[PDB]
Amino acid sequence: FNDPFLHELEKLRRESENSKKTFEEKKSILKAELERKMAEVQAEFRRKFHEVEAEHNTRTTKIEKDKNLVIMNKLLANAFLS
Amino acid sequence: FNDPFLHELEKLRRESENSKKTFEEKKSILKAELERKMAEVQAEFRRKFHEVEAEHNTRTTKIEKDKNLVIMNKLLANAFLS
């Protein structure tokens, strides 16, 4: 640059494009970290939850086998009479 | 319960009622801590964000005041006639 004024002015217009830039990018990084932490906190939830739900379905098919062993040994030892 | 068959049956209604109880309550807890983890991941993203936004607005007024300071200086050294 010839004019040390037009110079300083560009040195600063440039200086504020770096500003606008590193800001725009940080802004993106965070947005993209939050996105990932949230998808991973919700996949940790979905995990434990499908285990809790499994534990129960097995809990109740047990309770289930048995309820029907009762109803059978009853119905059986009772047609032994009629 | 006089009837022993009726007894086995009640013993089971009672067991299935705790299957449901502890399941629904396990469920209720996992959901409670999802709320809590997500709430705080996202309320510390904002804490981190506003700190870049802040950091930028200060950078930018810094520049703005270098600019202004350099323009007026030109304007003054150049404050005459003919």
Residue numbers in the entry:
A (entry chain A), B (entry chain B): 1732 to 1813
Copied sentences from the primary study:
Arabidopsis MORPHEUS' MOLECULE1 (MOM1) is an exceptional TGS regulator that acts largely independently of changes in the levels of DNA methylation and H3K9me2. MOM1 is a large nuclear protein of 2001 amino acids containing an incomplete and highly degenerate helicase domain related to a similar domain found in CHD3 chromatin-remodeling factors. Surprisingly, only the predicted nuclear localization signal (NLS) and a short fragment of MOM1 of less than 200 amino acids (1663 to 1859) containing a conserved plant-specific motif of 82 amino acids (1734 to 1815), named Conserved MOM1 Motif 2 (CMM2), is required for TGS activity. We solved the structure of this domain and found that it forms a dimer with each monomer consisting of unusual consecutive 11 amino-acid hendecad repeats folding into an antiparallel coiled-coil.
The best diffracting crystals were obtained with a MOM1 fragment corresponding to amino acid positions 1700 to 1814 (for experimental details, see and Materials and methods) and a complete dataset was collected to a maximal resolution of 3.2 Å. A poor electron density map, most likely the result of the absence of stable secondary structure, prevented us from building the first 28 as well as the last 3 amino acids of the CMM2-containing fragment. The structure reveals that the CMM2 motif folds as a long α-helix. Two such helices form an antiparallel coiled-coil structure. The asymmetric unit contains two identical coiled-coils that further interact via their N- and C-termini to form the crystal lattice. The mutual association of two CMM2 monomers occurs mainly through a large interface formed by hydrophobic residues. Additional stabilization of the coiled-coil comes from an intermolecular network of salt bridges established between glutamate and lysine residues. In contrast to the classical coiled-coil structure, CMM2 monomers are not wound around each other and, therefore, do not generate a left-handed super-coil. The CMM2 fragment forms dimeric coiled-coils with extensive hydrogen bonds or salt bridges mediating inter-chain contacts via residues at positions g and k.
